[PDB]
mmCIF file with all atom_site columns, C-alpha atoms in Angstrom:
data_model
loop_
_atom_site.group_PDB
_atom_site.id
_atom_site.type_symbol
_atom_site.label_atom_id
_atom_site.label_alt_id
_atom_site.label_comp_id
_atom_site.label_asym_id
_atom_site.label_entity_id
_atom_site.label_seq_id
_atom_site.pdbx_PDB_ins_code
_atom_site.Cartn_x
_atom_site.Cartn_y
_atom_site.Cartn_z
_atom_site.occupancy
_atom_site.B_iso_or_equiv
_atom_site.pdbx_formal_charge
_atom_site.auth_seq_id
_atom_site.auth_comp_id
_atom_site.auth_asym_id
_atom_site.auth_atom_id
_atom_site.pdbx_PDB_model_num
ATOM 1   C CA . UNK R 1 1   ? -27.940 60.961 58.455 1.00 0.00 ? 424 UNK R CA 1
ATOM 2   C CA . UNK R 1 2   ? -26.875 62.275 55.199 1.00 0.00 ? 425 UNK R CA 1
ATOM 3   C CA . UNK R 1 3   ? -26.322 59.732 51.971 1.00 0.00 ? 426 UNK R CA 1
ATOM 4   C CA . UNK R 1 4   ? -23.940 60.014 50.273 1.00 0.00 ? 427 UNK R CA 1
ATOM 5   C CA . UNK R 1 5   ? -25.553 59.802 46.122 1.00 0.00 ? 428 UNK R CA 1
ATOM 6   C CA . UNK R 1 6   ? -24.081 56.296 45.421 1.00 0.00 ? 429 UNK R CA 1
ATOM 7   C CA . UNK R 1 7   ? -24.032 54.943 49.452 1.00 0.00 ? 430 UNK R CA 1
ATOM 8   C CA . UNK R 1 8   ? -27.856 55.632 48.852 1.00 0.00 ? 431 UNK R CA 1
ATOM 9   C CA . UNK R 1 9   ? -28.315 53.675 45.353 1.00 0.00 ? 432 UNK R CA 1
ATOM 10  C CA . UNK R 1 10  ? -26.997 50.710 46.763 1.00 0.00 ? 433 UNK R CA 1
ATOM 11  C CA . UNK R 1 11  ? -28.721 50.946 49.868 1.00 0.00 ? 434 UNK R CA 1
ATOM 12  C CA . UNK R 1 12  ? -32.386 51.318 48.108 1.00 0.00 ? 435 UNK R CA 1
ATOM 13  C CA . UNK R 1 13  ? -31.126 48.721 45.815 1.00 0.00 ? 436 UNK R CA 1
ATOM 14  C CA . UNK R 1 14  ? -30.621 46.375 49.132 1.00 0.00 ? 437 UNK R CA 1
ATOM 15  C CA . UNK R 1 15  ? -33.886 47.315 50.354 1.00 0.00 ? 438 UNK R CA 1
ATOM 16  C CA . UNK R 1 16  ? -35.531 45.907 46.849 1.00 0.00 ? 439 UNK R CA 1
ATOM 17  C CA . UNK R 1 17  ? -36.721 49.248 46.090 1.00 0.00 ? 440 UNK R CA 1
ATOM 18  C CA . UNK R 1 18  ? -34.120 48.704 42.575 1.00 0.00 ? 441 UNK R CA 1
ATOM 19  C CA . UNK R 1 19  ? -36.913 48.516 39.778 1.00 0.00 ? 442 UNK R CA 1
ATOM 20  C CA . UNK R 1 20  ? -40.125 48.492 42.098 1.00 0.00 ? 443 UNK R CA 1
ATOM 21  C CA . UNK R 1 21  ? -43.316 48.716 40.519 1.00 0.00 ? 444 UNK R CA 1
ATOM 22  C CA . UNK R 1 22  ? -41.025 49.405 37.345 1.00 0.00 ? 445 UNK R CA 1
ATOM 23  C CA . UNK R 1 23  ? -39.325 53.003 38.532 1.00 0.00 ? 446 UNK R CA 1
ATOM 24  C CA . UNK R 1 24  ? -35.367 52.081 37.988 1.00 0.00 ? 447 UNK R CA 1
ATOM 25  C CA . UNK R 1 25  ? -32.975 53.080 41.011 1.00 0.00 ? 448 UNK R CA 1
ATOM 26  C CA . UNK R 1 26  ? -32.488 56.457 39.031 1.00 0.00 ? 449 UNK R CA 1
ATOM 27  C CA . UNK R 1 27  ? -35.376 57.717 39.613 1.00 0.00 ? 450 UNK R CA 1
ATOM 28  C CA . UNK R 1 28  ? -35.899 56.527 43.256 1.00 0.00 ? 451 UNK R CA 1
ATOM 29  C CA . UNK R 1 29  ? -32.370 58.110 44.199 1.00 0.00 ? 452 UNK R CA 1
ATOM 30  C CA . UNK R 1 30  ? -33.635 61.745 42.359 1.00 0.00 ? 453 UNK R CA 1
ATOM 31  C CA . UNK R 1 31  ? -36.633 61.615 43.971 1.00 0.00 ? 454 UNK R CA 1
ATOM 32  C CA . UNK R 1 32  ? -34.925 61.468 46.790 1.00 0.00 ? 455 UNK R CA 1
ATOM 33  C CA . UNK R 1 33  ? -31.720 64.087 46.786 1.00 0.00 ? 456 UNK R CA 1
ATOM 34  C CA . UNK R 1 34  ? -34.762 66.727 45.900 1.00 0.00 ? 457 UNK R CA 1
ATOM 35  C CA . UNK R 1 35  ? -37.488 65.426 48.441 1.00 0.00 ? 458 UNK R CA 1
ATOM 36  C CA . UNK R 1 36  ? -34.662 65.809 51.434 1.00 0.00 ? 459 UNK R CA 1
ATOM 37  C CA . UNK R 1 37  ? -30.871 66.154 49.456 1.00 0.00 ? 460 UNK R CA 1
ATOM 38  C CA . UNK R 1 38  ? -30.016 62.411 51.097 1.00 0.00 ? 461 UNK R CA 1
ATOM 39  C CA . UNK R 1 39  ? -30.104 63.452 54.074 1.00 0.00 ? 462 UNK R CA 1
ATOM 40  C CA . UNK R 1 40  ? -32.603 60.588 56.130 1.00 0.00 ? 463 UNK R CA 1
ATOM 41  C CA . UNK R 1 41  ? -33.549 63.349 59.066 1.00 0.00 ? 464 UNK R CA 1
ATOM 42  C CA . UNK R 1 42  ? -35.340 65.876 56.309 1.00 0.00 ? 465 UNK R CA 1
ATOM 43  C CA . UNK R 1 43  ? -38.387 67.034 58.315 1.00 0.00 ? 466 UNK R CA 1
ATOM 44  C CA . UNK R 1 44  ? -40.727 70.004 56.306 1.00 0.00 ? 467 UNK R CA 1
ATOM 45  C CA . UNK R 1 45  ? -44.248 70.788 57.279 1.00 0.00 ? 468 UNK R CA 1
ATOM 46  C CA . UNK R 1 46  ? -47.169 71.767 54.698 1.00 0.00 ? 469 UNK R CA 1
ATOM 47  C CA . UNK R 1 47  ? -49.366 74.332 54.887 1.00 0.00 ? 470 UNK R CA 1
ATOM 48  C CA . UNK R 1 48  ? -52.198 72.565 55.728 1.00 0.00 ? 471 UNK R CA 1
ATOM 49  C CA . UNK R 1 49  ? -50.726 71.052 59.243 1.00 0.00 ? 472 UNK R CA 1
ATOM 50  C CA . UNK R 1 50  ? -49.634 67.990 57.912 1.00 0.00 ? 473 UNK R CA 1
ATOM 51  C CA . UNK R 1 51  ? -45.737 67.094 57.821 1.00 0.00 ? 474 UNK R CA 1
ATOM 52  C CA . UNK R 1 52  ? -43.511 65.034 55.559 1.00 0.00 ? 475 UNK R CA 1
ATOM 53  C CA . UNK R 1 53  ? -40.587 63.050 56.833 1.00 0.00 ? 476 UNK R CA 1
ATOM 54  C CA . UNK R 1 54  ? -37.594 61.920 55.473 1.00 0.00 ? 477 UNK R CA 1
ATOM 55  C CA . UNK R 1 55  ? -35.294 60.876 52.792 1.00 0.00 ? 478 UNK R CA 1
ATOM 56  C CA . UNK R 1 56  ? -38.234 60.585 50.847 1.00 0.00 ? 479 UNK R CA 1
ATOM 57  C CA . UNK R 1 57  ? -40.501 63.691 52.133 1.00 0.00 ? 480 UNK R CA 1
ATOM 58  C CA . UNK R 1 58  ? -43.795 61.046 53.136 1.00 0.00 ? 481 UNK R CA 1
ATOM 59  C CA . UNK R 1 59  ? -46.247 62.913 54.333 1.00 0.00 ? 482 UNK R CA 1
ATOM 60  C CA . UNK R 1 60  ? -48.154 62.619 57.709 1.00 0.00 ? 483 UNK R CA 1
ATOM 61  C CA . UNK R 1 61  ? -51.467 63.524 56.157 1.00 0.00 ? 484 UNK R CA 1
ATOM 62  C CA . UNK R 1 62  ? -51.684 59.989 54.819 1.00 0.00 ? 485 UNK R CA 1
ATOM 63  C CA . UNK R 1 63  ? -48.953 57.277 55.355 1.00 0.00 ? 486 UNK R CA 1
ATOM 64  C CA . UNK R 1 64  ? -47.502 58.014 58.894 1.00 0.00 ? 487 UNK R CA 1
ATOM 65  C CA . UNK R 1 65  ? -48.841 59.226 62.974 1.00 0.00 ? 488 UNK R CA 1
ATOM 66  C CA . UNK R 1 66  ? -47.490 62.194 64.171 1.00 0.00 ? 489 UNK R CA 1
ATOM 67  C CA . UNK R 1 67  ? -50.221 63.059 66.851 1.00 0.00 ? 490 UNK R CA 1
ATOM 68  C CA . UNK R 1 68  ? -50.531 66.196 65.229 1.00 0.00 ? 491 UNK R CA 1
ATOM 69  C CA . UNK R 1 69  ? -52.215 65.794 61.956 1.00 0.00 ? 492 UNK R CA 1
ATOM 70  C CA . UNK R 1 70  ? -56.297 65.973 62.363 1.00 0.00 ? 493 UNK R CA 1
ATOM 71  C CA . UNK R 1 71  ? -58.151 64.362 60.392 1.00 0.00 ? 494 UNK R CA 1
ATOM 72  C CA . UNK R 1 72  ? -55.329 61.893 59.235 1.00 0.00 ? 495 UNK R CA 1
ATOM 73  C CA . UNK R 1 73  ? -54.750 58.338 58.673 1.00 0.00 ? 496 UNK R CA 1
ATOM 74  C CA . UNK R 1 74  ? -51.450 56.092 58.656 1.00 0.00 ? 497 UNK R CA 1
ATOM 75  C CA . UNK R 1 75  ? -51.368 53.722 56.513 1.00 0.00 ? 498 UNK R CA 1
ATOM 76  C CA . UNK R 1 76  ? -47.712 52.739 56.531 1.00 0.00 ? 499 UNK R CA 1
ATOM 77  C CA . UNK R 1 77  ? -48.724 51.750 59.768 1.00 0.00 ? 500 UNK R CA 1
ATOM 78  C CA . UNK R 1 78  ? -46.109 53.455 61.331 1.00 0.00 ? 501 UNK R CA 1
ATOM 79  C CA . UNK R 1 79  ? -44.750 56.836 63.983 1.00 0.00 ? 502 UNK R CA 1
ATOM 80  C CA . UNK R 1 80  ? -43.813 59.299 61.830 1.00 0.00 ? 503 UNK R CA 1
ATOM 81  C CA . UNK R 1 81  ? -40.139 59.708 63.260 1.00 0.00 ? 504 UNK R CA 1
ATOM 82  C CA . UNK R 1 82  ? -39.499 56.402 61.853 1.00 0.00 ? 505 UNK R CA 1
ATOM 83  C CA . UNK R 1 83  ? -39.136 57.765 58.932 1.00 0.00 ? 506 UNK R CA 1
ATOM 84  C CA . UNK R 1 84  ? -35.886 59.953 59.597 1.00 0.00 ? 507 UNK R CA 1
ATOM 85  C CA . UNK R 1 85  ? -34.505 56.013 61.207 1.00 0.00 ? 508 UNK R CA 1
ATOM 86  C CA . UNK R 1 86  ? -30.608 56.252 59.701 1.00 0.00 ? 509 UNK R CA 1
ATOM 87  C CA . UNK R 1 87  ? -31.961 52.697 58.094 1.00 0.00 ? 510 UNK R CA 1
ATOM 88  C CA . UNK R 1 88  ? -34.191 53.501 55.281 1.00 0.00 ? 511 UNK R CA 1
ATOM 89  C CA . UNK R 1 89  ? -36.020 50.173 55.649 1.00 0.00 ? 512 UNK R CA 1
ATOM 90  C CA . UNK R 1 90  ? -38.794 51.991 57.418 1.00 0.00 ? 513 UNK R CA 1
ATOM 91  C CA . UNK R 1 91  ? -39.672 54.371 54.805 1.00 0.00 ? 514 UNK R CA 1
ATOM 92  C CA . UNK R 1 92  ? -38.938 51.785 51.690 1.00 0.00 ? 515 UNK R CA 1
ATOM 93  C CA . UNK R 1 93  ? -41.110 49.808 53.379 1.00 0.00 ? 516 UNK R CA 1
ATOM 94  C CA . UNK R 1 94  ? -43.653 52.625 53.479 1.00 0.00 ? 517 UNK R CA 1
ATOM 95  C CA . UNK R 1 95  ? -42.630 54.109 49.673 1.00 0.00 ? 518 UNK R CA 1
ATOM 96  C CA . UNK R 1 96  ? -43.235 50.596 48.725 1.00 0.00 ? 519 UNK R CA 1
ATOM 97  C CA . UNK R 1 97  ? -47.438 51.172 49.535 1.00 0.00 ? 520 UNK R CA 1
ATOM 98  C CA . UNK R 1 98  ? -47.381 54.968 48.172 1.00 0.00 ? 521 UNK R CA 1
ATOM 99  C CA . UNK R 1 99  ? -45.876 54.346 44.933 1.00 0.00 ? 522 UNK R CA 1
ATOM 100 C CA . UNK R 1 100 ? -48.278 50.937 44.780 1.00 0.00 ? 523 UNK R CA 1
ATOM 101 C CA . UNK R 1 101 ? -51.781 53.183 45.090 1.00 0.00 ? 524 UNK R CA 1
ATOM 102 C CA . UNK R 1 102 ? -52.475 53.958 41.922 1.00 0.00 ? 525 UNK R CA 1
ATOM 103 C CA . UNK R 1 103 ? -50.240 57.271 40.604 1.00 0.00 ? 526 UNK R CA 1
ATOM 104 C CA . UNK R 1 104 ? -46.668 55.976 41.205 1.00 0.00 ? 527 UNK R CA 1
ATOM 105 C CA . UNK R 1 105 ? -43.762 58.066 41.732 1.00 0.00 ? 528 UNK R CA 1
ATOM 106 C CA . UNK R 1 106 ? -46.066 61.083 40.955 1.00 0.00 ? 529 UNK R CA 1
ATOM 107 C CA . UNK R 1 107 ? -47.009 60.792 44.330 1.00 0.00 ? 530 UNK R CA 1
ATOM 108 C CA . UNK R 1 108 ? -44.051 62.885 44.926 1.00 0.00 ? 531 UNK R CA 1
ATOM 109 C CA . UNK R 1 109 ? -44.222 66.316 43.898 1.00 0.00 ? 532 UNK R CA 1
ATOM 110 C CA . UNK R 1 110 ? -40.849 67.082 43.264 1.00 0.00 ? 533 UNK R CA 1
ATOM 111 C CA . UNK R 1 111 ? -40.216 63.924 40.949 1.00 0.00 ? 534 UNK R CA 1
ATOM 112 C CA . UNK R 1 112 ? -43.035 64.971 39.189 1.00 0.00 ? 535 UNK R CA 1
ATOM 113 C CA . UNK R 1 113 ? -41.561 68.461 38.541 1.00 0.00 ? 536 UNK R CA 1
ATOM 114 C CA . UNK R 1 114 ? -37.698 67.937 38.586 1.00 0.00 ? 537 UNK R CA 1
ATOM 115 C CA . UNK R 1 115 ? -37.331 63.907 38.265 1.00 0.00 ? 538 UNK R CA 1
ATOM 116 C CA . UNK R 1 116 ? -40.085 62.385 35.725 1.00 0.00 ? 539 UNK R CA 1
ATOM 117 C CA . UNK R 1 117 ? -38.193 62.642 31.983 1.00 0.00 ? 540 UNK R CA 1
ATOM 118 C CA . UNK R 1 118 ? -34.754 63.439 32.559 1.00 0.00 ? 541 UNK R CA 1
ATOM 119 C CA . UNK R 1 119 ? -31.699 61.008 32.383 1.00 0.00 ? 542 UNK R CA 1
ATOM 120 C CA . UNK R 1 120 ? -32.643 59.349 35.620 1.00 0.00 ? 543 UNK R CA 1
ATOM 121 C CA . UNK R 1 121 ? -29.485 56.989 35.559 1.00 0.00 ? 544 UNK R CA 1
ATOM 122 C CA . UNK R 1 122 ? -27.199 59.694 35.683 1.00 0.00 ? 545 UNK R CA 1
ATOM 123 C CA . UNK R 1 123 ? -28.246 59.578 39.496 1.00 0.00 ? 546 UNK R CA 1
ATOM 124 C CA . UNK R 1 124 ? -26.911 55.702 39.439 1.00 0.00 ? 547 UNK R CA 1
ATOM 125 C CA . UNK R 1 125 ? -23.655 56.572 36.989 1.00 0.00 ? 548 UNK R CA 1
ATOM 126 C CA . UNK R 1 126 ? -20.255 55.567 38.148 1.00 0.00 ? 549 UNK R CA 1
ATOM 127 C CA . UNK R 1 127 ? -22.036 53.482 41.124 1.00 0.00 ? 550 UNK R CA 1
ATOM 128 C CA . UNK R 1 128 ? -20.590 49.718 42.112 1.00 0.00 ? 551 UNK R CA 1
ATOM 129 C CA . UNK R 1 129 ? -23.581 48.200 42.321 1.00 0.00 ? 552 UNK R CA 1
#
């Protein structure tokens, strides 16, 4: 599923991500834009053999099991395929664990490099929420 900007904002809010760990909703929408272009089915292989999955490009090196990432962990206790669902519940639950892990939203390199410090409220500008 390819979300619209406000459609995603709304869904993230409904699942409790707005201001989770102090990160406003525009930060989450901005991260999703540059990680996946709002596409729940996005997958990308990393040089090291792990893969990133879903709207927030969660990595099999630590967070989910895809069965082909030797020496990896599954800290969200989910199959990586569940992060490709049209329903974002599993990606949200896992993202809450990642952003609590110590480095906040810097765990998402595209958030650091393209969202951090910018006018992230523009991502929710105009949305009925």
